[PDB]
Protein backbone atom coordinates (compact mmCIF):
# COMPACT_ATOMS: atom_id res chain seq x y z
CA UNK A 1 0.00 0.00 0.00
CA UNK A 2 1.43 3.36 1.08
CA UNK A 3 5.19 3.19 0.61
CA UNK A 4 7.74 5.99 1.05
CA UNK A 5 10.34 5.18 -1.62
CA UNK A 6 12.38 7.35 -3.96
CA UNK A 7 11.45 7.41 -7.65
CA UNK A 8 13.38 8.56 -10.71
CA UNK A 9 11.58 9.87 -13.80
CA UNK A 10 12.90 11.77 -16.80
CA UNK A 11 11.48 15.25 -17.38
CA UNK A 12 11.59 16.91 -20.81
CA UNK A 13 11.97 20.70 -20.75
CA UNK A 14 10.63 22.67 -23.70
CA UNK A 15 13.21 25.27 -24.80
CA UNK A 16 10.60 28.03 -25.12
CA UNK A 17 9.91 27.53 -21.39
CA UNK A 18 13.46 28.24 -20.18
CA UNK A 19 12.73 31.51 -18.38
CA UNK A 20 14.68 32.88 -15.42
CA UNK A 21 13.59 30.25 -12.87
CA UNK A 22 14.86 27.05 -14.47
CA UNK A 23 14.77 24.95 -11.29
CA UNK A 24 11.45 26.37 -10.05
CA UNK A 25 9.82 25.93 -13.46
CA UNK A 26 11.09 22.34 -13.69
CA UNK A 27 9.90 21.59 -10.14
CA UNK A 28 6.43 23.02 -10.83
CA UNK A 29 6.33 21.05 -14.09
CA UNK A 30 7.30 17.82 -12.32
CA UNK A 31 4.62 18.34 -9.67
CA UNK A 32 2.20 18.74 -12.57
CA UNK A 33 2.92 15.55 -14.48
CA UNK A 34 4.01 12.99 -11.89
CA UNK A 35 1.10 13.40 -9.47
CA UNK A 36 -2.07 11.39 -9.99
CA UNK A 37 -0.49 8.93 -12.43
CA UNK A 38 -0.17 5.15 -12.29
CA UNK A 39 2.27 2.48 -13.42
CA UNK A 40 2.41 -1.30 -13.32
CA UNK A 41 5.59 -1.49 -11.26
CA UNK A 42 4.78 1.06 -8.54
CA UNK A 43 1.01 1.49 -8.68
CA UNK A 44 -0.73 4.79 -8.05
CA UNK A 45 1.42 7.88 -7.46
CA UNK A 46 -0.07 9.48 -4.36
CA UNK A 47 2.28 12.28 -3.31
CA UNK A 48 5.87 13.42 -3.78
CA UNK A 49 7.57 14.44 -0.54
CA UNK A 50 10.91 15.87 -1.69
CA UNK A 51 12.83 16.23 -4.93
CA UNK A 52 16.12 14.51 -4.12
CA UNK A 53 18.31 16.04 -6.83
CA UNK A 54 18.30 17.64 -10.27
CA UNK A 55 20.67 16.15 -12.82
CA UNK A 56 22.83 17.90 -15.38
CA UNK A 57 21.06 19.03 -18.53
CA UNK A 58 21.73 16.98 -21.66
CA UNK A 59 20.71 18.37 -25.04
CA UNK A 60 19.43 15.58 -27.28
CA UNK A 61 21.20 15.40 -30.67
CA UNK A 62 18.80 16.86 -33.20
CA UNK A 63 16.03 17.41 -30.63
CA UNK A 64 15.50 20.83 -29.09
CA UNK A 65 14.12 19.80 -25.71
CA UNK A 66 16.60 19.22 -22.87
CA UNK A 67 16.26 16.27 -20.50
CA UNK A 68 16.89 16.54 -16.75
CA UNK A 69 17.49 13.28 -14.81
CA UNK A 70 15.54 13.98 -11.63
CA UNK A 71 15.26 11.65 -8.63
CA UNK A 72 12.69 12.37 -5.95
CA UNK A 73 11.26 10.82 -2.80
CA UNK A 74 7.56 10.05 -3.15
CA UNK A 75 4.64 8.15 -1.63
CA UNK A 76 3.00 5.48 -3.79
CA UNK A 77 0.13 3.05 -3.27
CA UNK A 78 0.07 -0.53 -4.50
CA UNK A 79 -2.62 -3.07 -3.53
CA UNK A 80 -1.59 -6.70 -3.19
CA UNK A 81 -3.33 -9.69 -4.75
CA UNK A 82 -4.30 -12.11 -2.00
CA UNK A 83 -4.52 -9.42 0.66
CA UNK A 84 -7.33 -7.87 2.72
CA UNK A 85 -7.95 -4.12 3.05
CA UNK A 86 -10.87 -2.26 4.59
CA UNK A 87 -13.00 -0.45 2.02
CA UNK A 88 -15.84 2.03 1.48
CA UNK A 89 -18.79 1.12 -0.74
CA UNK A 90 -19.49 3.41 -3.69
CA UNK A 91 -22.56 1.72 -5.18
CA UNK A 92 -24.61 -1.48 -4.84
CA UNK A 93 -26.18 -2.86 -8.02
CA UNK A 94 -27.99 -5.80 -9.61
CA UNK A 95 -24.66 -6.88 -11.08
CA UNK A 96 -22.56 -6.63 -7.93
CA UNK A 97 -20.94 -4.48 -5.28
CA UNK A 98 -18.80 -1.48 -6.27
CA UNK A 99 -16.36 -0.12 -3.70
CA UNK A 100 -13.36 2.19 -3.43
CA UNK A 101 -10.09 1.55 -1.60
CA UNK A 102 -8.61 5.03 -1.57
CA UNK A 103 -8.29 5.83 -5.26
CA UNK A 104 -8.47 2.17 -6.29
CA UNK A 105 -11.78 0.67 -7.40
CA UNK A 106 -12.82 -2.87 -6.48
CA UNK A 107 -15.77 -4.98 -7.62
CA UNK A 108 -17.45 -7.91 -5.86
CA UNK A 109 -19.64 -10.44 -7.63
CA UNK A 110 -22.66 -12.09 -6.06
CA UNK A 111 -20.64 -15.31 -6.27
CA UNK A 112 -17.93 -13.52 -4.26
CA UNK A 113 -20.39 -12.14 -1.68
CA UNK A 114 -21.95 -14.70 0.72
CA UNK A 115 -25.20 -16.19 -0.55
CA UNK A 116 -27.07 -15.02 2.55
CA UNK A 117 -25.81 -11.46 1.99
CA UNK A 118 -28.59 -10.77 -0.49
CA UNK A 119 -29.86 -7.60 -2.16
CA UNK A 120 -33.20 -5.90 -1.50
CA UNK A 121 -34.50 -3.82 -4.44
CA UNK A 122 -37.56 -2.88 -2.37
CA UNK A 123 -35.31 -0.82 -0.09
CA UNK A 124 -35.03 2.80 -1.22
CA UNK A 125 -31.23 2.84 -0.70
CA UNK A 126 -29.59 -0.03 -2.61
CA UNK A 127 -28.08 -2.32 0.00
CA UNK A 128 -27.07 -5.92 0.48
CA UNK A 129 -28.55 -7.56 3.57
CA UNK A 130 -28.98 -10.88 5.35
CA UNK A 131 -32.12 -12.90 6.00
CA UNK A 132 -32.03 -11.87 9.67
CA UNK A 133 -31.12 -8.27 8.64
CA UNK A 134 -28.05 -8.33 10.90
CA UNK A 135 -25.40 -7.34 8.33
CA UNK A 136 -26.52 -4.59 5.94
CA UNK A 137 -23.92 -3.12 3.58
CA UNK A 138 -24.88 0.39 2.44
CA UNK A 139 -23.17 2.95 0.24
CA UNK A 140 -20.33 4.84 1.98
CA UNK A 141 -20.07 2.13 4.66
CA UNK A 142 -16.75 0.90 6.03
CA UNK A 143 -16.43 -2.77 5.04
CA UNK A 144 -13.54 -5.21 4.84
CA UNK A 145 -12.92 -7.46 1.85
CA UNK A 146 -10.35 -10.00 0.68
CA UNK A 147 -8.81 -9.00 -2.65
CA UNK A 148 -8.36 -12.13 -4.76
CA UNK A 149 -7.37 -10.78 -8.20
CA UNK A 150 -5.52 -7.64 -9.31
CA UNK A 151 -5.13 -6.61 -12.95
CA UNK A 152 -4.03 -3.41 -14.69
CA UNK A 153 -5.15 -1.96 -18.02
CA UNK A 154 -4.03 1.34 -19.61
CA UNK A 155 -2.23 2.29 -16.36
CA UNK A 156 -5.36 1.84 -14.22
CA UNK A 157 -5.44 -0.44 -11.18
CA UNK A 158 -8.73 -2.08 -10.20
CA UNK A 159 -9.43 -5.22 -8.19
CA UNK A 160 -11.94 -7.97 -7.36
CA UNK A 161 -13.02 -8.58 -3.76
CA UNK A 162 -13.84 -11.93 -2.18
CA UNK A 163 -15.97 -12.70 0.88
CA UNK A 164 -16.27 -16.49 1.09
CA UNK A 165 -13.78 -16.40 3.97
CA UNK A 166 -15.05 -15.63 7.47
CA UNK A 167 -14.61 -12.28 9.26
CA UNK A 168 -15.34 -10.49 5.98
CA UNK A 169 -18.03 -7.83 5.68
CA UNK A 170 -18.91 -4.54 7.32
CA UNK A 171 -16.42 -3.35 9.93
CA UNK B 1 -4.04 5.69 -71.23
CA UNK B 2 -5.67 2.25 -71.07
CA UNK B 3 -8.48 1.47 -68.65
CA UNK B 4 -9.23 -2.14 -67.73
CA UNK B 5 -11.45 -3.78 -65.13
CA UNK B 6 -10.40 -7.07 -63.54
CA UNK B 7 -13.12 -9.16 -61.93
CA UNK B 8 -12.03 -10.44 -58.48
CA UNK B 9 -13.18 -13.58 -56.64
CA UNK B 10 -21.61 -4.72 -50.83
CA UNK B 11 -21.81 -2.17 -53.69
CA UNK B 12 -18.18 -2.88 -54.71
CA UNK B 13 -17.02 -4.51 -57.93
CA UNK B 14 -14.08 -5.42 -60.18
CA UNK B 15 -10.72 -3.78 -59.50
CA UNK B 16 -8.97 -1.18 -61.66
CA UNK B 17 -6.03 -1.97 -63.98
CA UNK B 18 -5.24 1.32 -65.70
CA UNK B 19 -1.95 1.59 -67.54
CA UNK B 20 -0.68 5.15 -67.54
CA UNK B 21 1.62 7.27 -69.61
CA UNK B 22 4.89 7.53 -67.70
CA UNK B 23 5.39 10.42 -65.28
CA UNK B 24 6.76 13.73 -66.64
CA UNK B 25 6.28 12.95 -70.33
CA UNK B 26 4.01 15.26 -72.32
CA UNK B 27 2.78 15.25 -75.89
CA UNK B 28 0.08 13.92 -78.17
CA UNK B 29 -1.19 10.44 -78.98
CA UNK B 30 -0.44 10.03 -82.69
CA UNK B 31 -2.04 6.66 -83.53
CA UNK B 32 -3.48 3.62 -81.77
CA UNK B 33 -3.80 -0.09 -82.47
CA UNK B 34 -6.30 -2.86 -81.73
CA UNK B 35 -5.74 -6.46 -82.83
CA UNK B 36 -5.73 -10.05 -81.57
CA UNK B 37 -2.83 -12.08 -80.20
CA UNK B 38 -1.95 -15.68 -80.98
CA UNK B 39 -4.17 -16.69 -78.04
CA UNK B 40 -7.24 -14.85 -79.33
CA UNK B 41 -7.29 -12.16 -76.64
CA UNK B 42 -7.71 -8.50 -77.52
CA UNK B 43 -4.43 -6.61 -77.74
CA UNK B 44 -3.95 -2.85 -77.84
CA UNK B 45 -0.91 -0.73 -78.68
CA UNK B 46 -0.81 3.05 -78.18
CA UNK B 47 2.01 5.27 -79.45
CA UNK B 48 2.85 8.59 -77.78
CA UNK B 49 4.36 11.43 -79.79
CA UNK B 50 6.38 14.18 -78.15
CA UNK B 51 8.01 17.12 -79.93
CA UNK B 52 11.24 18.44 -78.43
Amino acid sequence: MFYHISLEHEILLHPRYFGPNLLNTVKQKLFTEVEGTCTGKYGFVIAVTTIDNIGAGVIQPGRGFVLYPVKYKAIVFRPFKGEVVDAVVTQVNKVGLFTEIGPMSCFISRHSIPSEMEFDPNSNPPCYKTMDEDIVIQQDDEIRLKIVGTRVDKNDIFAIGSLMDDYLGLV
Amino acid sequence: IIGKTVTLPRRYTKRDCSTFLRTSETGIVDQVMVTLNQEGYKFCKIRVRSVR
Binding site: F18, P20, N21, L22, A56, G57, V58, I59, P61, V66 | -
Partner: protein
Protein backbone atom coordinates in the same frame (compact mmCIF):
# COMPACT_ATOMS: atom_id res chain seq x y z
CA UNK C 1 54.41 12.20 -44.82
CA UNK C 2 51.85 12.54 -42.00
CA UNK C 3 49.32 10.31 -43.75
CA UNK C 4 51.97 7.99 -45.20
CA UNK C 5 53.70 7.41 -41.85
CA UNK C 6 50.30 7.05 -40.19
CA UNK C 7 49.36 4.32 -42.67
CA UNK C 8 52.64 2.47 -42.11
CA UNK C 9 52.56 2.72 -38.31
CA UNK C 10 48.93 1.57 -38.22
CA UNK C 11 50.07 -1.32 -40.42
CA UNK C 12 52.94 -2.30 -38.12
CA UNK C 13 51.43 -1.29 -34.76
CA UNK C 14 50.26 -4.81 -33.83
CA UNK C 15 53.79 -6.15 -33.31
CA UNK C 16 53.81 -7.77 -36.76
CA UNK C 17 52.92 -7.16 -40.39
CA UNK C 18 49.29 -6.52 -41.35
CA UNK C 19 48.46 -7.27 -44.96
CA UNK C 20 45.10 -5.73 -45.88
CA UNK C 21 43.24 -9.02 -46.20
CA UNK C 22 40.45 -10.90 -44.51
CA UNK C 23 43.26 -13.27 -43.46
CA UNK C 24 44.60 -10.56 -41.17
CA UNK C 25 41.61 -8.40 -40.29
CA UNK C 26 39.70 -11.47 -39.10
CA UNK C 27 42.63 -12.31 -36.83
CA UNK C 28 42.67 -8.92 -35.16
CA UNK C 29 39.82 -8.67 -32.65
CA UNK C 30 38.68 -5.22 -33.78
CA UNK C 31 34.90 -5.61 -33.59
CA UNK C 32 32.64 -8.37 -34.89
CA UNK C 33 30.58 -5.92 -36.93
CA UNK C 34 33.75 -4.36 -38.34
CA UNK C 35 34.56 -7.90 -39.44
CA UNK C 36 31.02 -8.29 -40.83
CA UNK C 37 31.32 -4.95 -42.66
CA UNK C 38 34.47 -6.39 -44.25
CA UNK C 39 34.11 -8.63 -47.32
CA UNK C 40 33.27 -11.73 -45.27
CA UNK C 41 30.11 -11.29 -43.20
CA UNK C 42 28.39 -14.53 -42.23
CA UNK C 43 31.51 -16.43 -41.12
CA UNK C 44 32.87 -13.68 -38.89
CA UNK C 45 29.47 -13.01 -37.32
CA UNK C 46 28.87 -16.74 -37.02
CA UNK C 47 32.21 -17.26 -35.23
CA UNK C 48 31.57 -14.24 -32.98
CA UNK C 49 28.19 -15.73 -32.05
CA UNK C 50 29.68 -19.22 -31.69
CA UNK C 51 32.32 -17.94 -29.26
CA UNK C 52 29.94 -15.59 -27.45
CA UNK C 53 31.46 -12.22 -28.23
CA UNK C 54 30.89 -8.93 -26.41
CA UNK C 55 31.11 -5.60 -28.18
CA UNK C 56 30.53 -2.10 -26.74
CA UNK C 57 30.65 -0.63 -30.31
CA UNK C 58 33.37 1.98 -29.81
CA UNK C 59 33.68 2.00 -33.61
CA UNK C 60 31.96 4.12 -36.22
CA UNK C 61 30.17 1.97 -38.78
CA UNK C 62 28.68 -0.11 -35.96
CA UNK C 63 27.08 3.10 -34.69
CA UNK C 64 25.98 3.81 -38.26
CA UNK C 65 24.26 0.44 -38.73
CA UNK C 66 22.61 0.87 -35.35
CA UNK C 67 21.46 4.24 -36.69
CA UNK C 68 22.64 6.33 -33.77
CA UNK C 69 25.23 9.09 -33.57
CA UNK C 70 28.77 7.93 -34.28
CA UNK C 71 31.29 9.35 -31.78
CA UNK C 72 33.88 10.24 -34.43
CA UNK C 73 33.99 14.02 -34.19
CA UNK C 74 31.06 16.45 -34.53
CA UNK C 75 29.13 14.19 -32.20
CA UNK C 76 31.94 12.61 -30.23
CA UNK C 77 31.34 14.95 -27.28
CA UNK C 78 28.26 15.91 -25.27
CA UNK C 79 26.49 19.24 -24.80
CA UNK C 80 25.35 20.49 -21.40
CA UNK C 81 22.99 23.39 -20.75
CA UNK C 82 24.15 26.20 -18.45
CA UNK C 83 21.37 27.27 -16.08
CA UNK C 84 23.30 30.34 -14.86
CA UNK C 85 23.57 31.96 -18.29
CA UNK C 86 20.09 30.62 -19.06
CA UNK C 87 18.77 32.65 -16.10
CA UNK C 88 20.87 35.55 -17.38
CA UNK C 89 18.88 35.01 -20.58
CA UNK C 90 16.53 37.93 -21.17
CA UNK C 91 13.02 37.34 -22.49
CA UNK C 92 12.28 37.84 -26.18
CA UNK C 93 8.92 38.12 -28.03
Amino acid sequence: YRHLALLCDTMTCRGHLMAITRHGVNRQDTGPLMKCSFEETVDVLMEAAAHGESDPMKGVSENIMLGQLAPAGTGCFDLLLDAEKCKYGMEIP
